[PDB]
Amino acid sequence: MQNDAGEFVDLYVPRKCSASNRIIGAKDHASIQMNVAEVDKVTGRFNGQFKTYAICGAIRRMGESDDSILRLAKADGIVSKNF
Amino acid sequence: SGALDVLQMKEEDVLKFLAAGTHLGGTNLDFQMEQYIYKRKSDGIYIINLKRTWEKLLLAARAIVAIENPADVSVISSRNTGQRAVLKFAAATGATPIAGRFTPGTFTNQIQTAFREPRLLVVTDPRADHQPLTEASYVNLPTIALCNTDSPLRYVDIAIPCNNKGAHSVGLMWWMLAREVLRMRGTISREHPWEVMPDLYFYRDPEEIEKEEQAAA
Amino acid sequence: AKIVKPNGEKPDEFESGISQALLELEMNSDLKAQLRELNITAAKEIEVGGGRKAIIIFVPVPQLKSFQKIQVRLVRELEKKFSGKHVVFIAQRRILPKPTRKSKQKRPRSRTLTAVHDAILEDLVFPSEIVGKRIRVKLDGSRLIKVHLDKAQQNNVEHKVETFSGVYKKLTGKDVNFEFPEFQL
Amino acid sequence: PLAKDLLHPSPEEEKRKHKKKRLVQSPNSYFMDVKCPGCYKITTVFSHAQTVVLCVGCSTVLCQPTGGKARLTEGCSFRRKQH
Amino acid sequence: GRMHAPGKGLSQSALPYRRSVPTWLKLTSDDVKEQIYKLAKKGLTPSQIGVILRDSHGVAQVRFVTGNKILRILKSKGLAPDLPEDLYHLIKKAVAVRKHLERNRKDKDAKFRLILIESRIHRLARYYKTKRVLPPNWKYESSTASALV
Amino acid sequence: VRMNVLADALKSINNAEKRGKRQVLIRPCSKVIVRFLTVMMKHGYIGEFEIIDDHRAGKIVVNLTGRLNKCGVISPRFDVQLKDLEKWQNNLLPSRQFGFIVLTTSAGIMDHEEARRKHTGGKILGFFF
RNA sequence: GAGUACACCGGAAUGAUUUGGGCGUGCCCCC
RNA sequence: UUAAAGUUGCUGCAGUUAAAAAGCUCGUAGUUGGAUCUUGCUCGGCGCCGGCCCGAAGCGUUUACUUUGAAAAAA
């Protein structure tokens, strides 16, 4: 949140879920810090950099986190295109 | 697995799948497994599509190798079908095993002796291990469950569709998941057959243990 | 020749030349039993995107059904005469104004803007009839209508979709792309 | 599911759905063409014929009314035809 | 749902998208118009004429081959009945039900059905009076069927 | 039976937004409805949307995002003035820094701030925040 | 004229000759 | 007597079990009702050679809604 002065005033900004585009509260303990390791294109070993995501707890509790992770892998191209 | 052609069925993994039986499942449909499947046939056995199983096995391997320290990966089993497989999986990778009678409050109650704060959970079966999935809600634990056609999809993050009722299927898939994570860690090459034994991760009954050790030397 | 006008304007020399081309085709071929009592109203010049061009043929409404059954050979004859200009047949309908309170007999709904545009889009693609239409409303506010056509008569129509888009952009001003579904039919 | 595409479905689930509940109005009927083996010419009969239909010439009946599709007389062949 | 019934039904015609005379059909407007003329001289309802046409003679819909529907042509001649077919069928059903009541006196359910039918015919007759189809002096009583069956 | 088509459309898209579905089917369609989501999509609350154009009342499929809280209607359509607009947005909105009121106006169906800055008003339709 | 297969002509390819039919336009009858 | 009374609820209450939906149906007012339709034809002016444009006597769907003005006693 900004103001009329021109500097930041809020204490911190919360994260965003990557499926329903909602925030994760400070007392919601079902959040995910999933990282998927992308590899080198000619060898296949781990390079060093990660690829992080976040899914809120209500999507887990309904049970659609797996297809959400599959769609994010489809968008990032980590999983195969035809599948 | 990526568009690069180094991480697919070479010639023999599909043959091992058809020999073990990781392709045919139960007899009831699930609404979260409507795409990891092809068709119900006569005798009522649903057939799981295999490339999707391979892609989520690569996805689970990537999620395991993505974290730097392997000592805080809790592998969980309670059923007698996969007691040996998770123990030798933790021996091969360096994971922390729990085999038989998972204690409630292991991740929640902190003053007890059996306490652990891990970072990743790897579950053999969602229906049998419904208690680690409940304890994975209160603390931020992502999970991977080797799911079936008759397994509810609750509090799960990566689902690998397979028949987790035969000992050969679970032993082979735990073994090749260990193979994939040691290949991605940078210790095992893809060019040569390194393999120790697919039967080395297999659970077997004491009666067949007795009769085959009496028949053999 | 065979060019008629509702008002008092003599047709220009280009449309007169294409009319004399129509008269030498009817004098050439043995179609004089039915093309003799048919007329062409007007034509225009359309500069589509790229190095191509196209023409629109205005046909009056009450004998359009006579033009439908002979359309399959006239288009081929005008491509064999001059292949550097794609031809289409468009029925000419006028648009009556809205009945505002500033300004009379009732305006029929066959002459309204939506009906005229629907009939023009229907008559624009004769060898492939419309099987479905969807409308895209883009983020800036502009609209986009996509047209689905049947799988029949695809070998000679797929190279005309840019010309169809150019004609419909020139006449109406709405961006239209064409697609070919195959699973339903 | 969470993210199911409604822009274009597979034709299989289009065929399982009810005709009013489809994405576009498509009937579940067609026109068929049958002929008597003892006769010579071809008559076009609707699929739900709903009444006793006779070929002109008064030789043989063709269809019998049922609850759904009409029962064809034996020895008569039909073709699925598209306009 | 229904008007006088508690049940709900989803069963009606579903006309296709495409508005075109089919290519396999080899009939113009004039011969099918003359066939409609002949079956009107037979003495059928527009529903019966339409189902006979689409059953035997291979037409998708008359509205897609002619410029209008059946009843406008039937009123363009002038032999179409002064009583519309819906309200005529309601009178026929009502007089059949009433004739069932003068022999079965102790039948309350059939009396209830007759009350529902009289409600239907009044509700349709006020619409036909509103749309200026019938004379305003026309009304239906319990003993007026011999003038209009 | 169905009387307020916009109320049914906004109840359906509110249920779809609550359950996290990315797309939803709206069975009838109107110019007032497509203008209402034109206002919403110009304001950035939603994304792309198609119109299933057929020979009946059309169908609308939308590409929802997570920037939407609630869609509502005001039934029946009360008329407002420029004086009473602040009375409506004081008790109909969660805050004075965001959220909009869509009302029918002779200059076009549009939000409350444009109607304030061109000095006209009319009958009310609904709200979104 | 038959319409399940047949007895035949006028256009058009090469001066003169003519290539199996059916009406459900796409698969059905005689080899 | 007013606020607290969101215990008179138009904003803004309740009707399975605390106060409560007629036994059920039909039925005239009253209420609420599906989608679609994008300005011109007798007198004379700021200019000019029988004339161009503009101005205008006359007319150019009625309603609700919305916006600007008038008229609106003082305390």
Swiss-Prot record, chain A:
GO cellular component, one term: cytosolic ribosome
Cited Pfam families: Ribosomal_S21e
Key word Protease present: no
Molecular functions (GO terms): structural constituent of ribosome
Alphabetical UniProt keywords: Acetylation, Cytoplasm, Endoplasmic reticulum, Isopeptide bond, Ribonucleoprotein, Ribosomal protein, Ubl conjugation
Superkingdom, taxonomy of origin: Eukaryota
Cross-link Glycyl lysine isopeptide (Lys-Gly) (interchain with G-Cter in SUMO2) placement: K41
Primary location: cytoplasm
Biological-process GO terms, alphabetical: translation
Positions carrying N-acetylmethionine: M1
Keyword Coiled coil: no
InterPro entries, sorted: Ribosomal_eS21 (IPR001931), Ribosomal_eS21_CS (IPR018279), Ribosomal_eS21_sf (IPR038579)
Subcellular localization: Cytoplasm, Cytosol; Cytoplasm; Rough endoplasmic reticulum
Function: Component of the small ribosomal subunit. The ribosome is a large ribonucleoprotein complex responsible for the synthesis of proteins in the cell.
Family of the protein in this entry: Belongs to the eukaryotic ribosomal protein eS21 family.
Subunit composition and interactions: Component of the 40S small ribosomal subunit.
Name of protein: Small ribosomal subunit protein eS21
Curated annotation (Swiss-Prot), chain D:
Region feature (Disordered): 1-22
Protein residues bound to Zn(2+): C36, C39, C55, C58
Intracellular or extracellular location(s): Cytoplasm; Nucleus, Nucleolus
Record keywords, A-Z: Cytoplasm, Metal-binding, Nucleus, Phosphoprotein, Ribonucleoprotein, Ribosomal protein, Zinc, Zinc-finger
One Gene Ontology cellular component: cytosolic ribosome
Top-level lineage group: Eukaryota
Basic and acidic residues bias locations: 1-15
Main location: cytoplasm
Keyword Transcription regulation: no
Pfam families in the record: Ribosomal_S27e
Classification via HAMAP family: Ribosomal_eS27 (MF_00371)
Chain's role: Component of the small ribosomal subunit. The ribosome is a large ribonucleoprotein complex responsible for the synthesis of proteins in the cell. Required for proper rRNA processing and maturation of 18S rRNAs. Part of the small subunit (SSU) processome, first precursor of the small eukaryotic ribosomal subunit.
Protein name: Small ribosomal subunit protein eS27
Gene: RPS27
Swiss-Prot record, chain E:
Cross-link Glycyl lysine isopeptide (Lys-Gly) (interchain with G-Cter in ubiquitin): where in chain: K26
Modified residues (Phosphoserine): S29
GO cellular component, one term: cytosolic ribosome
Chain positions found as N6-acetyllysine: K26
Gene Ontology biological process: translation
Molecular function in Gene Ontology: small ribosomal subunit rRNA binding; structural constituent of ribosome
Residues the record lists as N6-succinyllysine modifications: K26, K33
Keyword Ubl conjugation: yes
UniProt keyword annotations, A-Z: Acetylation, Cytoplasm, Isopeptide bond, Nucleus, Phosphoprotein, Ribonucleoprotein, Ribosomal protein, Ubl conjugation
Thylakoid among keywords: no
Record's comment on post-translational modification: Ubiquitinated at Lys-26 by RNF14 and RNF25 in response to ribosome collisions (ribosome stalling).
PANTHER family given in the database record: RIBOSOMAL PROTEIN S15P/S13E, SMALL RIBOSOMAL SUBUNIT PROTEIN US15
Family annotation (HAMAP family): Ribosomal_uS15_A
Job of this protein: Component of the small ribosomal subunit. The ribosome is a large ribonucleoprotein complex responsible for the synthesis of proteins in the cell. Part of the small subunit (SSU) processome, first precursor of the small eukaryotic ribosomal subunit. During the assembly of the SSU processome in the nucleolus, many ribosome biogenesis factors, an RNA chaperone and ribosomal proteins associate with the nascent pre-rRNA and work in concert to generate RNA folding, modifications, rearrangements and cleavage as well as targeted degradation of pre-ribosomal RNA by the RNA exosome.
Protein name: Small ribosomal subunit protein uS15
Organism of provenance: Oryctolagus cuniculus (Rabbit)
Organismal lineage: Eukaryota, Metazoa, Chordata, Craniata, Vertebrata
From Swiss-Prot, chain F:
Pfam families per the UniProt record, alphabetical: Ribosomal_S8 (PF00410)
The keyword Ribonucleoprotein is assigned to this record: yes
GO biological process, one term: translation
UniProt record similarity statement: Belongs to the universal ribosomal protein uS8 family.
Gene Ontology cellular-component annotations: cytosolic ribosome; nucleolus; ribonucleoprotein complex
Subunit relationships: Component of the 40S ribosomal subunit. Part of the small subunit (SSU) processome, composed of more than 70 proteins and the RNA chaperone small nucleolar RNA (snoRNA) U3.
Keywords on record: Cytoplasm, Nucleus, Ribonucleoprotein, Ribosomal protein
Subcellular location(s) of the protein: Cytoplasm; Nucleus, Nucleolus
Protein's UniProt name: Small ribosomal subunit protein uS8
Residues spanning the membrane: none
Positions of post-translational N6-succinyllysine modification: K87
Keyword Cytoplasm among UniProt keywords: yes
InterPro entries in the record: Ribosomal_uS8, Ribosomal_uS8_CS, Ribosomal_uS8_sf
NCBIfam families documented for this protein: PRK04034.1 (NF003115)
GO terms of molecular function: structural constituent of ribosome
Function: Component of the small ribosomal subunit. Part of the small subunit (SSU) processome, first precursor of the small eukaryotic ribosomal subunit. During the assembly of the SSU processome in the nucleolus, many ribosome biogenesis factors, an RNA chaperone and ribosomal proteins associate with the nascent pre-rRNA and work in concert to generate RNA folding, modifications, rearrangements and cleavage as well as targeted degradation of pre-ribosomal RNA by the RNA exosome. Required for proper erythropoiesis.
